[PDB]
Design a protein around this ligand. Structure first.
Ligand SMILES: [Mg+2]
Length: 281
């Protein structure tokens, strides 16, 4: 059914029109905290800010600001934190958020360098014997293990709160093959990646929300959470054909602006859910 609507839009060449309609209907809420002068250097992009109502607050006595949003999907019973790729001065904040929110997994959908520019700070250690200390938030991060596959890398990290000496295992799911321009040709490897995150327990209710980022934390990040939520609803509902990807995306856009950045990303999301639903049969 969603598949019949897909072929209709394809045959009619109307992806841009459908996407502009979503842009026009999307919620608008204030971002007064993101726009305070003191926070200018905590934001990667002037045009991507968390809403005040859904932003993640840092606890540590100070400035509580990080560019991150809680996407809480009520019917699907799934939560996600969407955030920007860390900046050189926000790696300590990023790991503070992971600690305080009790996240088990971090999902990264970009490379540190793309199109010959830096899209995110090197916020995790690359060698077991070279751990990272974040002195501003009093956290230590160690690489425990790394498994490099053709389309993704999974890392086991140990995060230690140096104040209390408590340690937690964090799983880092790194999708390494999203192309520099456009979207993937096939959704097959992105779906395999999504099922690997699911299988880890990182998305399950006994943990805090999974942390998802790309460079801005709206485009690829949006695609990941939209695809996951739609596929869950199709398993949960008596009528799986009732799942309306445009309705789900507008719901998610109540919590963070700009999720899905292009008509091509919208088309790719439809493609991933349509293919993903056939695998869950
Ligand atoms: Mg070595």
């Amino acid at each position: 059914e969603m598949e019949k609507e897909f072929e209709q839009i394809d045959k009619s060449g109307s992806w841009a029109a459908i996407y502009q309609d979503i842009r026009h209907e999307a919620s608008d809420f204030p971002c007064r905290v993101a726009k305070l002068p003191k926070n200018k250097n905590r934001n990667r992009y002037r045009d991507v800010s968390p809403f005040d109502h859904s932003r993640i607050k840092l606890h540590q006595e100070d400035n509580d600001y990080i560019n991150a949003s809680l996407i809480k999907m009520e019917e699907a019973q799934r939560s996600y934190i969407l955030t920007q790729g860390p900046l050189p001065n926000t790696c300590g904040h990023f790991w503070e958020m992971v600690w305080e929110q009790k996240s088990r997994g971090v999902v990264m959908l970009n490379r540190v360098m793309e199109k010959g520019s830096l899209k995110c700070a090197q916020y995790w250690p690359q060698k077991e014997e070279k751990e990272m200390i974040f002195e501003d938030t009093n956290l230590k991060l160690t690489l425990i293990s790394e498994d490099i596959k053709s389309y993704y890398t999974v890392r086991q990290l140990e995060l230690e709160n140096l104040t209390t000496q408590e340690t937690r295992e964090i799983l880092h799911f790194h999708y390494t093959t999203w192309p520099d321009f456009g979207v993937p040709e096939s959704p097959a490897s992105f779906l395999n990646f999504l099922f690997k995150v699911r299988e880890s327990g990182s998305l399950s209710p006994e943990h805090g929300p999974v942390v998802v980022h790309c460079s801005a934390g709206i485009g690829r990040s949006g695609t990941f959470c939209l695809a996951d939520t739609c596929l869950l609803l199709m398993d949960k509902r008596k009528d799986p054909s009732s799942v309306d990807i445009k309705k789900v995306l507008l719901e998610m856009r109540k919590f963070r602006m700009g999720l899905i950045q292009t008509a091509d990303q919208l088309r790719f999301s439809y493609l991933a859910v349509i293919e993903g639903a056939k695998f869950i049969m």
